[PDB]
A paper describes a structure:
Modifying the protocol so exogenous ATP that was not removed prior to crystallization yielded distinct PilTGm crystals that diffracted to 1.9 Å, the highest resolution to date for any hexameric [name]/VirB11-like family member. The structure was solved by molecular replacement with three protomers in the asymmetric unit. In the crystal, two nearly identical C6 symmetric hexamers could be identified. Compared with the interfaces of PilBGm, all six interfaces in these hexamers are closed. Density consistent with Mg2+ and surprisingly for an active ATPase ATP could be modeled in the active sites. The ribose moiety of ATP puckers in two alternate conformations consistent with the small number of direct protein contacts to the O2’ of ATP. In addition, two ethylene glycol molecules from the cryoprotectant solution could be modeled in each packing-unit interface. As these crystals formed only when the pH was less than or equal to 6.5, we hypothesised that PilTGm may not have ATPase activity at acidic pH. When we assayed PilTGm ATPase activity over a broad range of pH values, we could not measure ATPase activity below pH 6.5. The corresponding histidine in PilB coordinates the nucleotide ɣ-phosphate, but in the CCCCCC [name] structure, H230 is facing away from the ɣ-phosphate in each of the nucleotide-binding sites.
[name] is the [name]/VirB11-like ATPase that powers T4aP depolymerisation. PilB is the ATPase that powers pilin polymerization in the T4aP. T4aP polymers can be rapidly depolymerized at the base, resulting in fiber retraction. Adjacent packing units adopt one of two conformations: open (O) or closed (C).
Residue numbers in the entry:
A (entry chain A), C (entry chain A): 1 to 353
B (entry chain B): 1 to 354
Write the structure that this text describes.
């Protein structure tokens, strides 16, 4: 029946986030978080292998067959780019494919508050975009980087596994290195990045202690560094970074973070109240002198109280404060807002007042 | 006399849990926990090798002869699936085979309380199914996963060594990866699972620090994660997870567990008082705000007191409370209930209270 | 002169425990702990090599010649089984051989108290048989396992280096794996033993931290686990197990031990007062609720006081209490009892009262 080109076109046309191909099921697309099967016969092992192999190079095929795992990205001219993962289950090939649009949407289209636009103007520091899997983090990062590319005459370097969004040069020089092709690893790229005269660097996830140290060094040496974590809040993000280090070296890490941290964004995507589309809920922490002191004084938990009152001055916003605003504008239902609040009793109190 | 197909048929027909093949003994089938020898001549070394090799591929035969060890699963069309272990003792092949039915029983048939069915509706978090060896853990997990498969339109990924229960697609997309064939290892499968757009993940036993960290990460990144441990209670399960980490990092592990933990099930299978069959005894801990606080404040022991009074509100149940109910229903004898109670004095108090 | 078959027959016939073959000495047999030379010419290097090689397979000969060390067991039909060790000294082969009877003696013949028979009825837990080298530990373990084999319909697995006592099936299924032939190592056997549906497992000596963790896991997962240590008392045994772990993880180990421990037996073999044969002296600790609390409370030393008064209720017995009974029945002399008491002044006090 349908070939890979038609399946990916249907994924794009229907606003799906992921296309799933596996044996004994028809192709399925995730729309607004939920899977929907396409009106097609179920695939067999011949189908899944042929469809997934149709978008691989010969080197990628040999590589997938050596490990039964493969991450990759590819483009279909005139349609979209895609991030693919291919694996093996029950002795057969399976694949998942995520849409990466060629055109980056704006801050207001993505539902990002104006403070996120101001983060794109920071000359230096560490900006963290956090949240659960598939919560819009790469899309937010692409919007920020596109703004920098538009407005600055600086050098942007990204290190990606794989490269997702493409950034053609506007006013910046943008260099994008793909792990496994352009560079051997994140570690090898970071070993030479300081000799490449960067101004803005995207390093991906802060996956281990070595990557955290690289990001802290980048942010301390006069660069604007963007990174991601899978944490769910500003406080949880700061604690996660500090606590990976041995107890005797955590004082320095807290001091470094207090100096270089310029923003923490924690995102989630919620189903809209209408039943179509998803809306962004975001917690924003922008450090002020009080928050930087709390970090140095090892009073990280008290940062949440500072965020509750930093709305007008610094554009800060707790997750519950964002859910409150989404509820008053009727963008989400009460069940969705409550089922997502990190503290439902606090959000209840905010409602009853 | 009998061939492997006939021996596995008797295993299934008799409701046994395991078939044992070893030299100088007839085939034996474990029924309700106790071995029963079949009315057959004892096997010799030729018999044990031939019977076990009849259910192996040539690649599996080569690997078994390379290591004198082998785990595997296989199916017999129209009968059942089986998990097998082949080994060598006294210079001869030996084998044990566990039944894996094609049909997944319901919560009611398995003796699982209604709170277990509500765990299958959880959209995120960490659910732990614990207990001793052969206590029904994989069967409970299959029942929960079959319920999710029936009710949700989500992506379920399992990593198994080997794959036991097979889950055909219902309303979910179900991908099942077998270690050693589909994926190199648990570690390699977990290295890529976040790029496979999952909603529900089965990771197997929390074998080491690395697997615990993977399961905690899965649970906090928006997924429903199922895993097993060989601990015997909810409190012992929480302590086991925290205590594997260095002392300075246990605070973060306790904070993570307090956020993501959605359920701990600890099971044991007991012989029925009727003499035929076994009955499930299960301790259920479902975190409420009080328990999550106790985890963060490093007061894990005080969780047991919360479970004693959380029956009506949250469906919680200590093991002794489950044993009490089984005794009231006359499913088990007093000796069996007392002999398996983790605190016989408490169960005695509960019985002679009124 | 005499061949290996005749030397091993003389070892069996004279009730010896070990036969020694080395150059410039006649064959010597250990009877009741003391060596006695046989009335034969001294052996040379040709003799020792020929005698020891007569009981080796070709693979064992190549193996011994590669390492100058070899542990093994073998049987002589109609006579006995034997555990052998072959080594090299002064450029020549030497060998020691221990008798392993085909018929396992009963509890009363071995001098084991009735509480040891009750340990064979335990459904689950950890049972430790401890004592110095050659103190009867394997023989006690074989008697317990034979009782389980007789009375239960369960699965017994032993891991041995090498297999000593053979256990033909009675009511149990008994599988015995020899390290270096049936299984690669203790570690590899223990890696798969939980997938082999065992009920009772013999794991040998708790030689390292990894083996202790395996035994604690077996005893906690619904199995009856038997293991040995070379400790001399119940308290010394418990302390040895806990103290091998780092200080931060000892709380869990004490908690595990308090849950799974079902018995500690510490044996010694003493020469009989008549001058012929040896008699077993044994310290028995069976945990009661008080002892299990002392383990959790890190009050291990106070367990000895509980054993002094647990004779009638739980069948417990300190080593000195056993020596006291052996002295009143005139089984041992005062010098032997005192020369063996771990606290001679306590045994003195028990005598003068
Ligand atoms: N602000 C947003 N509002 C609504 N939908 C969004 C938003 N941002 C991203 N999405 C959609 O969510 C899906 C995931 O996008 P994206 O890959 O950028 O997030 P992610 O956290 O980086 O995913 P992953 O964890 O796999 O790397 C996409 O389909 C995207 O169109
Ligand atoms: N609720 C139950 N009630 C009665 N019997 C059960 C129940 N659950 C499982 N069993 C039976 O117990 C035996 C073991 O089942 P299962 O393999 O699922 O447990 P397990 O703990 O995962 O075993 P293992 O430790 O080897 O992985 C099977 O024969 C099964 O039919
Ligand atoms: N209860 C007993 N009474 C008298 N003699 C015994 C008793 N048990 C064992 N023996 C004898 O002591 C000798 C050693 O026996 P055994 O090998 O079982 O002890 P062991 O501690 O396991 O030795 P090793 O440390 O070398 O492994 C044998 O000759 C045996 O016959
Ligand atoms: Mg991304
Ligand atoms: Mg299982
Ligand atoms: Mg021994």
């Amino acid at each position: 029946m349908a070939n890979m080109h038609q399946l990916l076109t249907e994924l794009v046309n229907r606003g799906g986030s992921d296309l799933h191909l596996t044996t004994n099921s028809p192709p399925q697309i995730r729309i607004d978080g939920k899977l929907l099967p396409l009106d097609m016969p179920p695939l067999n092992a011949v189908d899944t292998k042929q469809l997934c192999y149709s978008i691989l190079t010969e080197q990628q095929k040999h590589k997938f067959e050596e490990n039964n795992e493969l991450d990759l990205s590819f483009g279909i001219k005139g349609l979209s780019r895609f991030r693919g993962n291919v694996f093996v289950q029950r002795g057969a090939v399976a694949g998942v494919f995520r849409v990466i649009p060629y055109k980056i949407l704006s801050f207001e289209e993505l539902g990002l508050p104006p403070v996120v636009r101001e983060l794109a103007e920071k000359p230096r520091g560490l900006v963290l975009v956090t949240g659960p899997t598939g919560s819009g983090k790469s899309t937010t990062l692409a919007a920020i980087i596109d703004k920098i590319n538009t407005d600055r005459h600086e050098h942007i370097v990204t290190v990606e596994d794989p490269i997702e969004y493409l950034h053609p040069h506007k006013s910046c020089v943008v260099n994008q290195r793909e792990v496994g092709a352009d560079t051997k690893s994140f570690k090898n790229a970071l070993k030479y990045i300081l000799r490449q005269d960067p101004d803005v660097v995207l390093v991906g996830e802060l996956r281990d202690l070595e990557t955290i140290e690289a990001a802290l060094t980048l942010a301390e040496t006069g660069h604007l560094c963007f990174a991601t974590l899978h944490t769910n809040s500003a406080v949880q993000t700061i604690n996660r970074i500090v606590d990976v280090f041995p107890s005797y070296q955590q004082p320095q890490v807290r001091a470094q973070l207090s100096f270089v941290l310029e923003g923490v964004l924690s995102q989630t995507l919620l189903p809209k109240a209408s039943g179509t589309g998803r809306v962004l809920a975001i917690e924003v922490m922008v450090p002020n002198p009080a928050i930087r002191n709390l970090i140095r004084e090892d009073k990280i938990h008290q940062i949440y109280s500072q965020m509750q009152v930093g709305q007008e001055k610094f554009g800060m916003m707790t997750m519950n404060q964002c859910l409150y605003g989404l509820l008053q504008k009727r963008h989400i239902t009460m069940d969705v807002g409550m089922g997502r609040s990190p503290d439902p009793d606090e959000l209840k109190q905010m409602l009853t007042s």
